[PDB]
Design an enzyme around this catalytic site. Structure first.
Site, mmCIF file in Angstrom:
data_model
loop_
_atom_site.group_PDB
_atom_site.id
_atom_site.type_symbol
_atom_site.label_atom_id
_atom_site.label_comp_id
_atom_site.label_asym_id
_atom_site.label_seq_id
_atom_site.Cartn_x
_atom_site.Cartn_y
_atom_site.Cartn_z
ATOM 1 N N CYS A 1 0.518 -1.446 -0.068
ATOM 2 C CA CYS A 1 0.008 -0.407 0.007
ATOM 3 C C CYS A 1 1.049 1.289 -0.035
ATOM 4 C CB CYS A 1 -0.672 -0.432 1.267
ATOM 5 S SG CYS A 1 -0.071 -0.039 3.173
ATOM 6 N N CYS B 1 -1.741 3.610 1.074
ATOM 7 C CA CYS B 1 -1.367 3.955 2.519
ATOM 8 C C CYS B 1 0.077 4.740 2.757
ATOM 9 C CB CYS B 1 -1.649 2.930 3.344
ATOM 10 S SG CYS B 1 0.421 2.235 2.952
#
Ligand SMILES: Nc1nc2c(=O)[nH]cnc2n1CCCCOP(=O)(O)OP(=O)(O)OC[C@H]1O[C@H](O)[C@H](O)[C@@H]1O
Length: 244
Positions: A72, A154
């Protein structure tokens, strides 16, 4: 011809299948995907459907079969600078664009659509997003997969932007209209823009707009110029250089 846009790419079924085989052959995580099932789910999204009435739900089965964890913190988004972005992830295999995922890879540079109430693929024409209708098989595919891709991000998410454009950040692009709004503030600490030159383009009014939008979602914004794309790729390939 029924529609304004190009028709389905020649040998689209065979191409999708062979791309799936190739991808699942190369990537270990996908070593147990059934490529026939992937194709079945893919064509099931649009075959026999009116090509102006495609829904995100139509692609759900395909999304399920194509589910993939991507690191991520290693995501590269891009807008209007496809080539460099992909050359970059070709060298730096660490980083992933959407087209480096199974589903993005299957669909990249392809066009497809069906015909209402028949099993045929339309190789003559298909709806153009702008002239015909936006809920067409291709646009709805990219909207759905790009949303999911952005939701998976992320940490620091990077975006490559084209600094030769009149709108370096274009709020109406897929990146601006879908991806920026689907980054999760809980997970994403920073969106960092790489503005690619063909001047401090990080002071451009559209980058300032991007900055304001992202900040207001409680995500930090950073921006960097890439003055020399060629030298950039050079250093990506040979980074230990003092010159880098
Ligand atoms: N990614 C992609 N490949 C294709 C294709 O081969 N055919 C038709 N569409 C395609 N897409 C989605 C549309 C990208 C074309 O540029 P656009 O419509 O102006 O919007 P952009 O900001 O340039 O989109 C690129 C960003 O969205 C994508 O998710 C990509 O990951 C990138 O972050």
């Amino acid at each position: 011809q029924t529609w304004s846009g190009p028709g389905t790419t020649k040998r689209f079924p065979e191409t999708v299948l062979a791309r799936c085989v190739k991808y699942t052959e190369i990537h270990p995580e996908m070593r147990h995907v059934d490529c026939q099932s992937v194709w079945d789910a893919f064509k099931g999204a649009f075959i026999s459907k009116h090509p102006c009435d495609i829904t995100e739900e139509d692609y759900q089965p395909l999304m399920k079969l194509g589910t993939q964890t991507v690191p991520c913190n290693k995501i590269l988004l891009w807008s209007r600078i496809k080539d460099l972005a992909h050359q970059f992830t070709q060298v730096q295999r660490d980083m992933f664009t959407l087209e480096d995922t199974l589903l993005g890879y299957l669909a990249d540079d392809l066009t497809w659509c069906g015909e209402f109430d028949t099993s045929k693929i339309n190789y003559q024409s298909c709806p153009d997003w702008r002239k015909d209708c936006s809920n067409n098989p291709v646009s709805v595919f990219w909207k759905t997969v790009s949303r999911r891709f952005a939701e998976a991000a992320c940490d620091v998410v990077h975006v490559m932007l084209d600094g030769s454009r009149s709108k370096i950040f274009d709020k109406d692009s897929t990146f601006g209209s879908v991806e920026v709004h689907n980054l999760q503030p809980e997970k994403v600490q920073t969106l960092e823009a790489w503005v690619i030159h063909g001047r401090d383009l990080c002071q451009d009014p559209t980058i300032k707009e991007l900055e304001s939008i992202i900040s207001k979602r409680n995500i930090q914004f950073s921006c960097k110029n890439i003055y020399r794309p060629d030298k950039f790729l050079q250093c990506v390939k040979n980074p230990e250089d003092s010159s880098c």
